[PDB]
Design a protein. Structure first.
Lengths: 49, 49
């Protein structure tokens, strides 16, 4: 997104009914901190939400 | 009288119904504990792994 919503009125974009390529999240290095609760921070591709 | 009492009255066999019921509850309770979270992020073992 070019511009995001502010922290008090933060946006909420629900995603459903498609294939989620988590590879672009797992292999990326531009993410300074990926400190990830709940599930493993790398192998996201092997779950269905 | 035994034939009629046992066929009619369901609680007549309570001494045996309680043992079968305790075993059904013990196993059903054990499986519901397999459905219990116990403080973990999830109760389901395949999803945890």
């Amino acid at each position: 997104a070019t511009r995001f919503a502010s922290v008090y009125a933060w946006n909420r974009k629900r995603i459903s009914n498609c294939v989620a390529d988590y590879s672009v999240l797992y292999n990326s290095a531009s993410f300074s901190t990926f400190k990830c609760y709940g599930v493993s921070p790398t192998k996201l591709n092997d779950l269905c939400f | 009288k035994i034939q009629d009492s046992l066929s009619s009255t369901p609680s007549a066999l309570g001494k045996l119904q309680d043992v079968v019921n305790q075993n059904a509850q013990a196993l059903n309770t054990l499986v519901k504990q397999l459905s219990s979270n116990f403080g973990a992020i999830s109760s389901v073992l395949n999803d945890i792994l």
